[PDB]
Short mmCIF file of C-alpha atoms and ligand atoms in Angstrom, two decimals:
data_model
loop_
_atom_site.label_atom_id
_atom_site.label_comp_id
_atom_site.label_asym_id
_atom_site.label_seq_id
_atom_site.Cartn_x
_atom_site.Cartn_y
_atom_site.Cartn_z
CA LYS A 2 -1.60 -26.79 -0.41
CA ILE A 3 -3.04 -25.34 2.78
CA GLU A 4 -2.73 -27.48 5.92
CA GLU A 5 -6.15 -28.29 7.42
CA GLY A 6 -6.83 -27.96 11.15
CA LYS A 7 -4.58 -24.93 11.66
CA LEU A 8 -4.38 -21.19 10.85
CA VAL A 9 -1.60 -19.49 8.93
CA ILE A 10 -1.90 -15.69 9.03
CA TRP A 11 -0.12 -13.07 6.89
CA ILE A 12 0.09 -9.42 7.95
CA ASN A 13 2.47 -6.60 7.00
CA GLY A 14 5.65 -6.19 9.02
CA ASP A 15 4.82 -2.63 10.03
CA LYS A 16 1.75 -3.91 11.95
CA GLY A 17 1.50 -5.48 15.42
CA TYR A 18 2.12 -9.07 14.36
CA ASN A 19 3.46 -9.99 17.80
CA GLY A 20 0.22 -8.70 19.30
CA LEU A 21 -1.76 -10.74 16.79
CA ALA A 22 0.30 -13.80 17.71
CA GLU A 23 -0.92 -13.44 21.33
CA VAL A 24 -4.49 -13.60 20.06
CA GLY A 25 -3.33 -16.68 18.18
CA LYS A 26 -1.98 -18.15 21.42
CA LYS A 27 -5.29 -17.56 23.20
CA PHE A 28 -7.16 -19.22 20.33
CA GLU A 29 -4.82 -22.22 20.62
CA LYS A 30 -5.35 -22.26 24.40
CA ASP A 31 -9.15 -22.43 24.03
CA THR A 32 -9.46 -24.58 20.88
CA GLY A 33 -6.27 -26.60 20.41
CA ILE A 34 -5.97 -25.07 16.94
CA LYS A 35 -2.47 -23.65 16.45
CA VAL A 36 -2.14 -20.20 14.85
CA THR A 37 0.92 -19.10 12.85
CA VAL A 38 1.49 -15.39 12.12
CA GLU A 39 3.96 -14.45 9.39
CA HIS A 40 5.02 -11.12 7.89
CA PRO A 41 6.61 -11.94 4.52
CA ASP A 42 8.32 -9.31 2.33
CA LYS A 43 6.30 -7.75 -0.51
CA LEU A 44 3.11 -9.14 1.02
CA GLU A 45 0.68 -7.28 -1.26
CA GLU A 46 2.26 -9.06 -4.24
CA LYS A 47 3.20 -12.38 -2.68
CA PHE A 48 -0.42 -13.12 -1.74
CA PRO A 49 -2.03 -12.99 -5.19
CA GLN A 50 1.03 -14.79 -6.62
CA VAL A 51 0.80 -17.82 -4.29
CA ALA A 52 -2.99 -17.70 -3.81
CA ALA A 53 -3.62 -17.86 -7.56
CA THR A 54 -1.97 -21.29 -7.44
CA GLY A 55 -4.20 -22.35 -4.54
CA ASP A 56 -1.73 -22.03 -1.65
CA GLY A 57 -0.96 -19.20 0.81
CA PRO A 58 -2.28 -18.20 4.26
CA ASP A 59 -5.78 -18.94 5.54
CA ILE A 60 -6.11 -15.25 6.41
CA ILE A 61 -4.58 -12.22 4.70
CA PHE A 62 -4.31 -8.74 6.26
CA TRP A 63 -3.94 -5.61 4.14
CA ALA A 64 -5.60 -2.24 3.66
CA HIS A 65 -8.94 -2.62 1.86
CA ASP A 66 -7.74 -1.18 -1.46
CA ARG A 67 -6.15 -4.43 -2.70
CA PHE A 68 -9.07 -6.68 -1.81
CA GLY A 69 -11.29 -5.85 -4.78
CA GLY A 70 -8.57 -7.22 -7.06
CA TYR A 71 -8.21 -10.31 -4.86
CA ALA A 72 -11.98 -10.83 -4.92
CA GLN A 73 -12.20 -10.42 -8.68
CA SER A 74 -9.41 -13.00 -9.05
CA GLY A 75 -11.38 -15.48 -6.91
CA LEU A 76 -8.83 -15.52 -4.09
CA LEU A 77 -11.23 -14.59 -1.26
CA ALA A 78 -14.08 -16.46 0.46
CA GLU A 79 -17.35 -14.56 0.92
CA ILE A 80 -17.75 -13.22 4.45
CA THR A 81 -21.16 -13.76 6.08
CA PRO A 82 -21.45 -12.12 9.52
CA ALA A 83 -24.76 -12.36 11.38
CA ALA A 84 -26.60 -9.09 12.05
CA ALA A 85 -25.54 -8.67 15.68
CA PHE A 86 -21.88 -9.06 14.78
CA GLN A 87 -22.20 -6.78 11.77
CA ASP A 88 -23.75 -4.15 14.06
CA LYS A 89 -20.64 -4.18 16.29
CA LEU A 90 -18.54 -2.48 13.56
CA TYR A 91 -19.04 0.93 11.94
CA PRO A 92 -21.10 0.80 8.71
CA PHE A 93 -18.48 2.80 6.79
CA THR A 94 -15.83 0.20 7.56
CA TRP A 95 -18.06 -2.56 6.15
CA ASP A 96 -18.60 -0.35 3.10
CA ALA A 97 -14.83 -0.39 2.54
CA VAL A 98 -14.82 -4.19 2.32
CA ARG A 99 -17.85 -4.52 0.05
CA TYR A 100 -17.18 -5.61 -3.53
CA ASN A 101 -19.85 -6.17 -6.19
CA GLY A 102 -22.68 -6.75 -3.74
CA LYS A 103 -20.84 -8.81 -1.12
CA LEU A 104 -18.57 -8.50 1.90
CA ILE A 105 -15.13 -9.87 1.06
CA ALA A 106 -13.21 -9.17 4.26
CA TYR A 107 -13.48 -8.18 7.92
CA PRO A 108 -12.60 -4.53 8.62
CA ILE A 109 -10.19 -4.04 11.52
CA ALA A 110 -9.09 -0.41 11.69
CA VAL A 111 -9.12 2.94 9.91
CA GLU A 112 -5.69 4.47 9.11
CA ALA A 113 -4.56 7.82 7.76
CA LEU A 114 -1.25 9.66 7.60
CA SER A 115 -0.54 12.55 9.97
CA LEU A 116 2.26 15.03 10.49
CA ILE A 117 4.43 13.85 13.39
CA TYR A 118 6.74 16.50 14.85
CA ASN A 119 9.46 16.84 17.48
CA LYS A 120 8.17 19.39 20.02
CA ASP A 121 11.64 20.09 21.42
CA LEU A 122 12.94 20.98 17.96
CA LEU A 123 9.75 22.55 16.69
CA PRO A 124 7.41 23.93 19.37
CA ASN A 125 4.79 24.88 16.79
CA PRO A 126 4.45 22.69 13.69
CA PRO A 127 4.27 24.46 10.29
CA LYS A 128 0.81 25.29 8.93
CA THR A 129 1.90 25.13 5.29
CA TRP A 130 4.15 23.06 3.03
CA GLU A 131 5.41 26.34 1.56
CA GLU A 132 7.23 27.39 4.75
CA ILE A 133 9.21 24.16 5.16
CA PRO A 134 12.22 25.23 3.02
CA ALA A 135 12.76 28.28 5.28
CA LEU A 136 12.31 25.97 8.27
CA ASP A 137 14.89 23.49 6.95
CA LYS A 138 17.44 26.29 6.49
CA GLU A 139 17.11 27.31 10.18
CA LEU A 140 17.41 23.71 11.33
CA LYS A 141 20.38 22.87 9.09
CA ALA A 142 22.40 25.47 11.03
CA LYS A 143 21.81 23.40 14.18
CA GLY A 144 22.83 20.24 12.36
CA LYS A 145 19.21 19.18 11.90
CA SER A 146 16.67 18.95 9.08
CA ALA A 147 13.01 19.91 8.82
CA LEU A 148 11.41 16.82 7.31
CA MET A 149 12.03 13.20 6.32
CA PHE A 150 9.51 10.67 5.13
CA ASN A 151 9.32 7.58 2.90
CA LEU A 152 9.76 8.63 -0.74
CA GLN A 153 9.70 5.07 -2.14
CA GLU A 154 5.96 4.45 -1.56
CA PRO A 155 3.53 6.88 -3.24
CA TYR A 156 1.11 6.50 -0.29
CA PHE A 157 3.24 9.02 1.64
CA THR A 158 3.48 11.56 -1.20
CA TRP A 159 -0.22 11.20 -2.15
CA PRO A 160 -1.58 13.76 0.39
CA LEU A 161 0.46 16.50 -1.33
CA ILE A 162 -0.37 15.36 -4.89
CA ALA A 163 -4.08 15.38 -4.01
CA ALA A 164 -4.06 18.72 -2.16
CA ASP A 165 -4.40 21.01 -5.18
CA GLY A 166 -6.56 18.68 -7.30
CA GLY A 167 -4.94 15.32 -7.98
CA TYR A 168 -7.18 12.29 -7.65
CA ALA A 169 -7.07 8.57 -8.37
CA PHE A 170 -10.37 7.57 -10.02
CA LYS A 171 -13.40 9.87 -10.29
CA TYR A 172 -16.43 8.76 -8.27
CA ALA A 173 -19.88 9.56 -9.70
CA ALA A 174 -23.23 7.72 -9.70
CA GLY A 175 -22.15 5.19 -7.06
CA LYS A 176 -19.34 4.05 -9.36
CA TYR A 177 -15.69 4.77 -9.95
CA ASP A 178 -15.11 5.78 -13.57
CA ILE A 179 -12.06 3.72 -14.59
CA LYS A 180 -11.50 6.10 -17.53
CA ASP A 181 -11.41 9.26 -15.43
CA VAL A 182 -8.01 9.44 -13.72
CA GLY A 183 -6.58 12.58 -12.11
CA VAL A 184 -2.87 11.79 -11.95
CA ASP A 185 -1.68 14.30 -14.55
CA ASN A 186 -4.00 17.23 -14.00
CA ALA A 187 -2.73 20.65 -12.94
CA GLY A 188 -3.21 19.95 -9.23
CA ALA A 189 -1.27 16.69 -9.20
CA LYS A 190 1.54 18.34 -11.15
CA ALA A 191 1.76 21.30 -8.76
CA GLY A 192 2.04 19.04 -5.70
CA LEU A 193 4.66 16.74 -7.18
CA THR A 194 6.59 19.76 -8.54
CA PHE A 195 6.69 21.08 -4.98
CA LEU A 196 8.02 17.73 -3.72
CA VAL A 197 10.68 17.59 -6.44
CA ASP A 198 11.79 21.15 -5.65
CA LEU A 199 12.27 20.15 -1.99
CA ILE A 200 14.61 17.43 -3.26
CA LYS A 201 16.39 19.69 -5.78
CA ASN A 202 17.06 22.23 -3.02
CA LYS A 203 18.39 19.48 -0.75
CA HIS A 204 15.66 19.74 1.89
CA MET A 205 14.98 16.10 1.17
CA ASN A 206 16.78 13.19 -0.45
CA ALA A 207 15.20 11.00 -3.17
CA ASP A 208 16.72 7.83 -1.68
CA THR A 209 15.02 8.22 1.72
CA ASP A 210 12.87 5.19 2.51
CA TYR A 211 10.77 4.05 5.49
CA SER A 212 13.65 2.77 7.68
CA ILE A 213 15.81 5.81 6.96
CA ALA A 214 13.08 8.33 7.83
CA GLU A 215 12.00 6.47 10.95
CA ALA A 216 15.59 6.26 12.23
CA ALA A 217 16.20 9.95 11.62
CA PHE A 218 13.03 11.08 13.41
CA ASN A 219 13.37 8.63 16.30
CA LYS A 220 17.00 9.68 16.85
CA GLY A 221 15.99 13.34 16.95
CA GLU A 222 17.82 14.28 13.72
CA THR A 223 14.79 15.58 11.82
CA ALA A 224 11.98 17.76 13.19
CA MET A 225 9.09 16.16 11.28
CA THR A 226 8.03 12.99 9.55
CA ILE A 227 4.83 11.76 7.89
CA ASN A 228 3.57 8.41 9.10
CA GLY A 229 0.59 6.37 10.33
CA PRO A 230 -0.54 5.07 13.76
CA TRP A 231 1.61 1.92 13.50
CA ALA A 232 4.69 4.14 13.85
CA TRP A 233 3.92 5.57 17.32
CA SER A 234 5.19 2.50 19.18
CA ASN A 235 8.81 2.98 18.07
CA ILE A 236 8.61 6.72 18.68
CA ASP A 237 7.39 6.02 22.24
CA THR A 238 10.31 3.63 22.86
CA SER A 239 12.63 6.40 21.76
CA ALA A 240 10.77 8.66 24.15
CA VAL A 241 10.89 11.51 21.59
CA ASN A 242 8.66 14.36 22.77
CA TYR A 243 6.34 14.19 19.76
CA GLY A 244 2.98 15.53 18.63
CA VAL A 245 0.66 14.12 15.97
CA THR A 246 -1.17 16.78 14.01
CA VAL A 247 -2.83 17.99 10.82
CA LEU A 248 -0.75 17.73 7.64
CA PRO A 249 0.51 21.04 6.25
CA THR A 250 -1.65 22.77 3.65
CA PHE A 251 -0.55 23.32 0.05
CA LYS A 252 -1.72 26.40 -1.83
CA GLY A 253 -4.06 27.07 1.08
CA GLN A 254 -5.79 23.70 0.72
CA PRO A 255 -5.61 20.70 3.07
CA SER A 256 -3.36 17.77 2.24
CA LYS A 257 -5.65 14.85 1.42
CA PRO A 258 -4.31 11.53 2.62
CA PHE A 259 -5.87 8.37 1.25
CA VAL A 260 -7.74 6.57 4.01
CA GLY A 261 -7.15 2.87 4.43
CA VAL A 262 -9.19 0.30 6.35
CA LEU A 263 -6.92 -2.51 7.55
CA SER A 264 -8.91 -5.60 6.67
CA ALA A 265 -8.70 -9.37 7.04
CA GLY A 266 -9.79 -11.69 4.25
CA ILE A 267 -10.11 -15.48 4.18
CA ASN A 268 -8.34 -17.48 1.45
CA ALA A 269 -10.86 -19.06 -0.93
CA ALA A 270 -8.61 -22.13 -1.07
CA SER A 271 -8.64 -22.46 2.72
CA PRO A 272 -10.13 -25.67 4.17
CA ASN A 273 -10.14 -23.83 7.50
CA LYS A 274 -12.79 -21.23 6.65
CA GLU A 275 -15.03 -21.89 9.68
CA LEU A 276 -12.04 -21.74 12.04
CA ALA A 277 -10.87 -18.51 10.39
CA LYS A 278 -14.33 -17.05 10.96
CA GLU A 279 -14.27 -18.01 14.65
CA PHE A 280 -10.78 -16.56 15.18
CA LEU A 281 -11.68 -13.29 13.47
CA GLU A 282 -15.17 -12.68 14.91
CA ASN A 283 -14.84 -14.04 18.45
CA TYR A 284 -11.15 -13.55 19.20
CA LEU A 285 -9.62 -10.74 17.13
CA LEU A 286 -12.58 -8.43 16.76
CA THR A 287 -13.19 -8.10 20.52
CA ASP A 288 -12.00 -5.49 23.04
CA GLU A 289 -9.33 -7.94 24.25
CA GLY A 290 -8.16 -9.06 20.82
CA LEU A 291 -7.81 -5.53 19.46
CA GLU A 292 -6.11 -4.29 22.62
CA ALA A 293 -3.43 -6.96 22.26
CA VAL A 294 -2.69 -5.95 18.65
CA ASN A 295 -3.00 -2.24 19.44
CA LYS A 296 -0.51 -2.43 22.35
CA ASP A 297 2.06 -3.88 19.97
CA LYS A 298 1.54 -1.37 17.14
CA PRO A 299 -1.33 1.16 17.27
CA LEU A 300 -4.13 0.38 14.83
CA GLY A 301 -5.58 3.87 14.52
CA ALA A 302 -9.37 4.18 14.84
CA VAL A 303 -10.57 0.59 15.20
CA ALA A 304 -13.66 -0.68 13.37
CA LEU A 305 -15.09 -2.16 16.60
CA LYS A 306 -17.40 0.46 18.16
CA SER A 307 -16.82 -0.62 21.76
CA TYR A 308 -13.00 -0.37 21.71
CA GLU A 309 -13.03 2.69 19.42
CA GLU A 310 -15.01 4.60 22.06
CA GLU A 311 -12.54 3.55 24.77
CA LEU A 312 -9.58 4.89 22.76
CA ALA A 313 -11.14 7.93 21.10
CA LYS A 314 -9.82 10.34 23.75
CA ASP A 315 -6.21 9.79 22.52
CA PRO A 316 -5.24 13.08 20.81
CA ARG A 317 -3.13 11.09 18.34
CA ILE A 318 -6.19 9.12 17.22
CA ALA A 319 -8.18 12.36 17.06
CA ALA A 320 -5.45 13.79 14.83
CA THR A 321 -5.56 10.67 12.62
CA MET A 322 -9.31 11.10 12.15
CA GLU A 323 -8.99 14.82 11.48
CA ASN A 324 -6.58 14.03 8.65
CA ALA A 325 -8.77 11.16 7.42
CA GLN A 326 -11.76 13.52 7.25
CA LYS A 327 -9.80 15.81 4.89
CA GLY A 328 -8.83 12.89 2.65
CA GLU A 329 -10.66 10.21 0.68
CA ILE A 330 -11.38 6.52 1.30
CA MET A 331 -9.28 4.50 -1.19
CA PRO A 332 -11.19 2.83 -4.04
CA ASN A 333 -11.08 -0.99 -3.90
CA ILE A 334 -11.50 -1.55 -7.64
CA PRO A 335 -9.27 -4.18 -9.31
CA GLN A 336 -7.47 -1.39 -11.21
CA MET A 337 -5.91 -0.17 -7.93
CA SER A 338 -2.83 -2.40 -8.10
CA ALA A 339 -1.77 -1.13 -11.54
CA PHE A 340 -2.66 2.42 -10.51
CA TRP A 341 -0.40 2.33 -7.49
CA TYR A 342 2.54 0.88 -9.43
CA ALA A 343 2.27 3.54 -12.16
CA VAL A 344 2.13 6.34 -9.60
CA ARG A 345 4.96 4.77 -7.60
CA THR A 346 7.13 4.81 -10.73
CA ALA A 347 6.16 8.41 -11.55
CA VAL A 348 7.05 9.69 -8.07
CA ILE A 349 10.34 7.76 -8.00
CA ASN A 350 11.33 8.88 -11.52
CA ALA A 351 10.47 12.53 -10.92
CA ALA A 352 12.26 12.50 -7.54
CA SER A 353 15.40 10.89 -8.94
CA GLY A 354 15.41 13.20 -11.98
CA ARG A 355 14.86 10.38 -14.48
CA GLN A 356 11.78 12.19 -15.81
CA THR A 357 10.41 15.67 -15.51
CA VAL A 358 7.29 15.89 -13.34
CA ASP A 359 5.08 16.37 -16.41
CA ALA A 360 6.45 13.35 -18.24
CA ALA A 361 6.36 11.18 -15.11
CA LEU A 362 2.69 11.92 -14.40
CA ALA A 363 1.64 11.89 -18.06
CA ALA A 364 2.98 8.34 -18.34
CA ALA A 365 1.33 7.19 -15.09
CA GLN A 366 -1.97 8.71 -16.24
CA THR A 367 -1.81 6.99 -19.63
CA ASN A 368 -0.93 3.62 -18.18
CA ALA A 369 -3.58 3.72 -15.42
CA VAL A 370 -6.32 4.59 -17.92
CA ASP A 371 -5.23 2.25 -20.71
CA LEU A 372 -4.39 -0.74 -18.48
CA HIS A 373 -2.12 -2.71 -20.84
CA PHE A 374 -1.92 -6.51 -20.51
CA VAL A 375 1.67 -6.28 -19.22
CA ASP A 376 0.57 -3.90 -16.44
CA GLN A 377 -2.57 -5.74 -15.48
CA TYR A 378 -0.71 -9.06 -15.10
CA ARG A 379 2.69 -7.64 -14.10
CA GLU A 380 2.60 -9.52 -10.77
CA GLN A 381 1.74 -12.89 -12.39
CA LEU A 382 4.37 -12.45 -15.10
CA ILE A 383 7.05 -11.59 -12.52
CA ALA A 384 6.35 -14.86 -10.72
CA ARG A 385 5.82 -17.07 -13.77
CA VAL A 386 8.10 -15.97 -16.64
CA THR A 387 11.12 -18.28 -16.58
CA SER A 388 12.95 -17.81 -19.89
CA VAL A 389 14.17 -14.30 -19.10
CA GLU A 390 17.23 -14.36 -21.40
CA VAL A 391 15.07 -15.30 -24.39
CA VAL A 392 12.77 -12.35 -23.69
CA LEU A 393 15.73 -9.98 -23.24
CA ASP A 394 17.24 -10.95 -26.59
CA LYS A 395 13.92 -10.51 -28.38
CA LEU A 396 13.72 -6.98 -26.94
CA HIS A 397 17.39 -6.02 -27.31
CA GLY A 398 17.73 -3.34 -29.96
CA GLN A 399 14.03 -2.64 -30.59
CA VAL A 400 12.71 -1.93 -27.12
CA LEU A 401 15.65 -2.31 -24.72
CA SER A 402 18.87 -0.31 -24.79
CA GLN A 403 22.18 -2.10 -24.17
CA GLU A 404 22.34 -0.58 -20.68
CA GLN A 405 18.80 -1.64 -19.76
CA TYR A 406 19.46 -5.15 -21.11
CA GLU A 407 22.53 -5.31 -18.86
CA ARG A 408 20.66 -3.93 -15.83
CA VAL A 409 17.90 -6.56 -16.09
CA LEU A 410 20.30 -9.43 -16.61
CA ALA A 411 22.29 -8.37 -13.51
CA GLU A 412 19.43 -9.17 -11.14
CA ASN A 413 19.82 -12.35 -9.09
CA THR A 414 16.56 -14.30 -9.41
CA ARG A 415 14.10 -14.63 -12.29
CA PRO A 416 11.44 -12.62 -10.44
CA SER A 417 14.01 -9.87 -9.62
CA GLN A 418 14.97 -9.75 -13.29
CA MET A 419 11.33 -9.62 -14.43
CA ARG A 420 10.55 -7.03 -11.76
CA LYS A 421 13.39 -4.85 -13.05
CA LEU A 422 12.24 -5.24 -16.65
CA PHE A 423 8.69 -4.11 -15.82
CA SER A 424 9.98 -1.27 -13.68
CA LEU A 425 12.19 0.07 -16.49
CA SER A 426 9.39 -0.29 -19.00
CA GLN A 427 6.75 1.18 -16.74
CA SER A 428 7.02 4.63 -18.29
CA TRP A 429 7.34 3.43 -21.92
CA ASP A 430 4.55 4.04 -24.40
CA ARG A 431 1.89 1.62 -25.69
CA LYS A 432 3.98 0.67 -28.71
CA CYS A 433 6.90 -0.45 -26.58
CA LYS A 434 4.55 -2.24 -24.18
CA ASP A 435 3.12 -4.07 -27.21
CA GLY A 436 6.66 -5.10 -28.12
CA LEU A 437 7.15 -6.37 -24.58
CA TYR A 438 3.86 -8.30 -24.77
CA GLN A 439 4.88 -9.78 -28.13
CA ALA A 440 8.20 -11.04 -26.79
CA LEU A 441 6.47 -12.61 -23.78
CA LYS A 442 3.87 -14.28 -25.97
CA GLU A 443 6.48 -15.66 -28.37
CA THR A 444 8.52 -16.99 -25.44
CA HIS A 445 5.75 -18.39 -23.22
CA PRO A 446 2.59 -18.77 -25.31
CA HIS A 447 0.86 -21.18 -22.92
CA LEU A 448 1.31 -18.76 -20.00
CA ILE A 449 -0.06 -15.81 -22.00
CA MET A 450 -2.98 -17.95 -23.20
CA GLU A 451 -3.66 -19.02 -19.60
CA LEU A 452 -3.78 -15.36 -18.48
CA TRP A 453 -6.32 -14.44 -21.19
CA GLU A 454 -8.50 -17.43 -20.21
CA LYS A 455 -8.58 -16.82 -16.45
CA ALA A 456 -9.53 -13.17 -16.94
CA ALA A 457 -12.60 -14.38 -18.81
CA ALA A 458 -13.36 -17.12 -16.25
CA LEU A 459 -13.81 -14.52 -13.50
O1 LIG B 501 2.36 3.21 -1.55
C1 LIG B 501 1.35 2.46 -2.15
C2 LIG B 501 0.54 1.64 -1.20
O2 LIG B 501 -0.24 2.52 -0.32
C3 LIG B 501 -1.05 1.76 0.66
O3 LIG B 501 -0.24 1.00 1.44
C4 LIG B 501 0.08 1.53 2.75
C5 LIG B 501 -0.74 0.82 3.75
O4 LIG B 501 -2.17 1.05 3.48
C6 LIG B 501 -0.45 1.16 5.10
O5 LIG B 501 -1.17 0.22 6.02
C7 LIG B 501 0.96 1.09 5.46
O6 LIG B 501 1.34 -0.25 5.60
O7 LIG B 501 1.85 1.70 4.49
C8 LIG B 501 1.58 1.30 3.05
C9 LIG B 501 2.40 2.07 2.28
O8 LIG B 501 3.78 1.70 2.29
C10 LIG B 501 -1.98 0.84 -0.04
O9 LIG B 501 -2.75 0.21 0.93
C11 LIG B 501 -1.20 -0.11 -0.88
O10 LIG B 501 -2.03 -1.01 -1.58
C12 LIG B 501 -0.33 0.60 -1.87
O11 LIG B 501 0.45 -0.30 -2.60
#
């Protein structure tokens, strides 16, 4: 369980965890309470997996979009700031952490993607996405390339999908309509078609991930990348002469990045809730706390009015906000986790040529709207299904091909095997998903029964 009388903190590894650790050191200096900051892999999934059991960190950091799901699952303590403290942060940041009438986290900072460009390679950044292929051709002659960014996380491709009309869930009458999804409309298709064409014409490579794109930009090999405030620290170290600016337009319309509010929630199973509150309100969310984190990795536009004003002159922060204003705040509904995984699979499949754009998005759309049991509880099943071989043999023939069977089996741990199986099946139709559910239920009926029950408990 969770050790009492101390703080364990989880934050993503792309954030200023060293800076946060300093705030932890100051807290220890003034209170005697030791603070431990960790940045585990696959944090957005690890948390609900271990927290559902009743363990995990006292405090979890992520963008606000995942917190609605955490709250619905009972993993988060209710946050009760007094009025004077609440007034120290922007109202729209509190709005991002409000779920079903209550505050479920502390907002820290507002993030949005921008175009980052090498001024020595590219004195004026391109206005449009459409002119990048011509740009890449010029640069290739100098042994360079126009653009590299993470193509493994749909967050980075989202601004282009949304530009001409794609959207996640429709918002109307103060509610998100969970049945109105805009992943396979004409606009989403046009944007992703443009991305795929960049890859087909070798302006980009489908295998490019975060580390690969960062290395290429920071070594001066590519003229542009797409990234958030957290990335500026490494670019500074590399002393690249860079600018941060508005994303290119597509079909004459702005790219629309999703806006995230980095937020901190308190584990509902934590016996250290009061301590967590003190650390967050009186140590982190102060000019001195935020500055320490921000000097490690930039936070963007912080939620704290006083420090936001001090930093607002930074043209890079201005550029972040300009992009944010063209985009949309992410929904925090519990459906977000399944939505992101479906879209992630669609972008990866279309980029790798495993599916056409139309088929990739049509499948994502169907699965986000229909929310099958195996998609809703994918994360729990990955962590809790243990008889993988039994499931594979039930599916072999009917649902799984010989090759897919072999691919799943080849993974090293049970969760890696399960994760592969759900990835492969992600684009399958309802009937195949039903076959997958049936095999899981025959193999582990108590687990499946437990999942049905807890859904109803919450
Ligand atoms: O790609 C899907 C992913 O997008 C967002 O995650 C961002 C995150 O908000 C940023 O702070 C930064 O860490 O990069 C991530 C993308 O790799 C969503 O917040 C997240 O839930 C979602 O899975």
